[PDB]
Write a protein that binds this ligand. Structure first.
Ligand SMILES: CC(=O)N[C@@H]1[C@@H](O)[C@@H](F)[C@@](OP(=O)(O)OC[C@H]2O[C@@H](n3ccc(N)nc3=O)[C@H](O)[C@@H]2O)(C(=O)O)O[C@H]1[C@H](O)[C@H](O)CO
Ligand SMILES: [Ca+2]
Length: 474
């Protein structure tokens, strides 16, 4: 009989990998290890060992080391071929002040802790909170933001970490709209350090704002030519040979020209359906990606439990509440206050009026059938949330602190969603969006002005709503 087993593994510099036969007996008539490629490193004594330690050296570049074990018994020959590649350590750096990028990043971190258990992670998130215990579970060190952006504390921590290593790969994960505020402060001081490589950049939309910006930019003359022309502008700024930075889209959608970059779009098809963005679609090419909504469900049960704990969402309870009554489920999305100089109570009352219209079968804006009522208040709603919830005795509360985007991520969207406009509507399937209410703002003071706004024009183009779904409350 002959058995041949093969495997490969990355070994981080200075870490240990145990070479051992794969699925073989513990004892042999004869046996040997030999090294078949890579700089000689096998010790003479280990040739007759069954298992022994490979300690990864510190190198100027990655290198593969190949080892073959041969073991013979009376009726069976066992061969194990193991290829070890010595790699630089990887530091993963996460920066976000919103919700959606942080939530996507958290899923990635949970996966990556299992796939890359040696990697250190530095995390600066404004909305998602990782406590000390969960942080240790995920090899996370948390750092504050400076306002909304990368802190000097984080920059110095990365500098120190880099200094401590023979070589370093850095992976960045951040918010697409604010990439230029977050990455250059880290990239610039490391730029001339040849042992440090920015190995990957992952950029995530945070919501509607990236689409409004694209909408406002789509008719700009010669816009891709201008983008191309600003690549060197970004490059020289990062290299610290010029103080001039690209303005606008040039500091946002040129990263893939300089680094291995993925742009995760919440609605990648916007680049398809909006004809004046076909040129940007082509310019980004394979770097443009669709943000996935189903990765949570592919996590293991224990991993799902960890995600839920960190984001503060009792999914099991909401599942139970959805099933309390056999009616389909409606979530009203609340807001805070808006323009007009009215009292807090006025803003709560207007939202109560909206719900009353929604559940009134004689109203033109009736949801269309009977639903069980659920309330997702704005996190900053305060007493407004209490007033609204208290106005509907059988309405079930979904804790306002939870980012609404957690529901779409965990496949916990209800049958229908309606209420005050928010970025959260950009990640709800059209079939689940009932109506959206726009309130008085500096740019919107009636329904006609709402319909003509960039935000609504984008949602119409994307099919999130039709005009009949767009409502106004002063
Ligand atoms: C153009 C403009 O002024 N945009 C602002 C925006 O800069 C920000 F100020 C905010 O952002 P807004 O997208 O409403 O909400 C931000 C985040 O809050 C959470 N959320 C909100 C409501 C809710 N019922 N459950 C939730 O969970 C979601 O995570 C969401 O992504 C805000 O008040 O924080 O309000 C909007 C608009 O003034 C508002 O949308 C008009 O209705
Ligand atoms: Ca129900």
């Amino acid at each position: 009989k002959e058995t041949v087993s093969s495997n490969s593994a990355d070994v981080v510099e200075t870490e240990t990998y145990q070479l051992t036969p794969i699925d073989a007996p513990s004892s042999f008539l004869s046996h040997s290890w030999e090294q078949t490629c890579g700089t000689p490193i096998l010790n003479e004594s280990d040739k007759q060992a069954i298992s022994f330690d490979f300690v990864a050296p510190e190198l100027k570049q990655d290198e593969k080391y190949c080892f073959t074990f041969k073991g013979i018994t009376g009726d069976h020959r066992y061969i194990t071929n193991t290829t070890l590649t010595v790699v630089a350590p990887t530091l993963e750096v996460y920066i976000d002040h919103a919700s959606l990028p942080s939530l996507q990043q958290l899923i990635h971190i949970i996966q990556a802790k299992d796939e890359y258990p040696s990697n250190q992670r530095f995390v600066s998130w404004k909305r998602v909170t990782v406590d000390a215990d969960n942080a240790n579970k995920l090899n996370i060190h948390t750092y504050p933001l400076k306002g909304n952006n990368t802190s000097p504390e984080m920059v110095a921590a990365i500098d120190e970490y880099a200094q401590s290593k023979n070589r370093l790969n850095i992976e960045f994960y951040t918010n697409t709209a604010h990439v230029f505020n977050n990455l250059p402060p880290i990239i610039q001081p490391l730029y001339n350090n040849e042992k440090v490589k920015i190995s990957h950049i992952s950029l995530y939309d945070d919501g509607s704002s990236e689409y409004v910006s694209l909408y406002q930019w789509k008719d700009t003359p010669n816009k891709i030519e201008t983008l191309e022309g600003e690549v060197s502008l970004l490059a020289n700024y990062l290299a610290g040979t010029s103080p001039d930075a690209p303005k606008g889209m040039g500091n946002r959608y040129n990263w893939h020209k300089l680094y291995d970059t993925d742009y995760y779009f919440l609605r990648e098809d916007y680049l398809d359906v909006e004809a004046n963005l076909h040129d940007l679609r082509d310019y980004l090419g394979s770097s443009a990606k669709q943000m996935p909504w189903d990765e949570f469900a592919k996590l293991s049960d224990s991993q799902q439990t960890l995600f839920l704990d960190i984001v503060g969402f009792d999914k099991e309870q909401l599942q139970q509440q959805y099933s309390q009554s056999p009616l389909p489920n409606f979530i009203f999305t609340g807001t805070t206050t808006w323009a007009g100089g009215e009292t807090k109570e006025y803003y709560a009352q207007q939202q109560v009026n909206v719900i009353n219209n929604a559940i009134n079968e004689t109203s033109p804006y009736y949801l269309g059938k009977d639903y069980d009522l659920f309330f997702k208040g704005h996190p900053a709603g305060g007493v407004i949330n209490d007033i609204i919830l208290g106005s509907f005795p059988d309405m079930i509360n979904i804790p306002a602190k939870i980012s609404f985007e957690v529901l779409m991520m965990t496949d916990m969207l209800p049958d229908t969603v309606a209420g005050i406009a928010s970025s959260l509507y950009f990640t709800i399937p059209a079939d689940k969006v009932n109506f959206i209410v726009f309130t008085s703002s500096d740019t919107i003071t009636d329904r006609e002005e709402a319909l003509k706004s960039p935000l609504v024009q984008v949602m119409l183009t994307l099919g999130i709503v039709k005009e009949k779904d767009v409502l106004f409350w002063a």
